[PDB]
Design a binder for this molecule. Structure first.
Ligand code: BEF
Ligand SMILES: [Mg+2]
Ligand SMILES: [Zn+2]
Lengths: 113, 62, 104
């Protein structure tokens, strides 16, 4: 019985960027893993369909960093309230284990068809 | 301590002339018709060393 | 323990479902635990033959060939396709001493 993420994750907050340049103050959303280490967000989502890099804020003072993305995969991601399209880019350089925990949490515990 | 600096330089000139007398006697022995025929068919001129006695030698010892 | 000794797979009871096209096989304790058996049993001894057939004769290679980098990257894709970590055939392009040990 090898189970993926036998304990769930939490946290959703802050922003990221859409224009490598812009990321003015509020672009897209970051998802999960405060990450014991400190802060390591596993995955990213968006209400839009245009995001090249993302200056996602982080702890300390040098929190600014280019948390860029890669070719996405979109889902219907039906909100309980109603339908809403959301394109899921993954953090550049994620490994197959983390993309398993993320997918397991936001699909099996959320309303997706 | 200066006889010993002389001794060593005289010696340094006797080994520098013995390796030279070797690397020029193990060279006049390369049938340079069968050796320039595989360094030429090589892509860049590099070949494995284990195939030089195997394809360009004249004598076999079993 | 979910692949018998013929290659057939069979416990699908701890698998989740996502949108088609994005599935993530997690193979990291399957390959790593199996690794010491891949050289004891000499698994890849049928790759020296002319059609990967244990009956047809051996491959006669060029004697002046020494690179073998395009065939090292094709052996990784045939058997270890979903092993997610960069493989450097020539370890002079590695990134630290824990990458030299992985790629060698
Ligand atoms: F792997 Be068993 F079906 F819990
Ligand atoms: Mg089982
Ligand atoms: Zn490496």
């Amino acid at each position: 019985n090898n189970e993926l993420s036998p304990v769930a994750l939490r946290q959703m907050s802050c922003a990221a960027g859409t224009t490598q340049t812009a990321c003015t103050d509020d672009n897209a959303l970051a998802y999960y893993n405060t990450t014991k280490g400190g802060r390591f967000v596993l995955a990213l989502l968006s209400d839009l369909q245009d995001l090249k890099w993302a200056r996602f804020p982080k702890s300390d003072g040098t929190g600014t960093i280019y948390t860029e993305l890669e070719p996405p995969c979109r889902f219907v991601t039906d909100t309980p309230k109603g339908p809403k399209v959301k394109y899921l880019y993954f953090i550049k350089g994620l490994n197959n284990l983390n993309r398993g925990m993320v997918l397991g949490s936001l699909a099996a515990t959320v309303r997706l068809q | 301590q200066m006889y010993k600096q002389a001794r060593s330089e005289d010696k340094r000139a006797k080994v520098t002339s013995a390796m030279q007398t070797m690397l020029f006697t193990m060279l006049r022995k390369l049938d340079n018709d069968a050796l320039n025929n595989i360094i030429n068919n090589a892509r860049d001129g590099c070949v494995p060393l284990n195939i030089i006695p195997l394809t360009t030698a004249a004598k076999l010892m079993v | 323990d979910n692949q018998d000794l013929n290659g057939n797979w069979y416990d699908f009871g701890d698998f989740i479902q996502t949108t088609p096209g994005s599935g993530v096989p997690v193979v990291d304790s399957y390959y790593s635990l199996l690794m010491p058996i891949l050289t004891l049993t000499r698994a890849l001894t049928a790759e020296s033959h002319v059609d990967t057939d244990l009956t047809k004769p051996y491959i006669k290679w060029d004697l002046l060939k020494y690179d073998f980098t395009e065939e090292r990257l094709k052996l990784f894709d045939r058997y270890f396709k979903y092993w997610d970590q960069t493989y450097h055939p020539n370890c002079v392009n590695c990134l630290d001493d824990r990458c030299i040990l992985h790629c060698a």
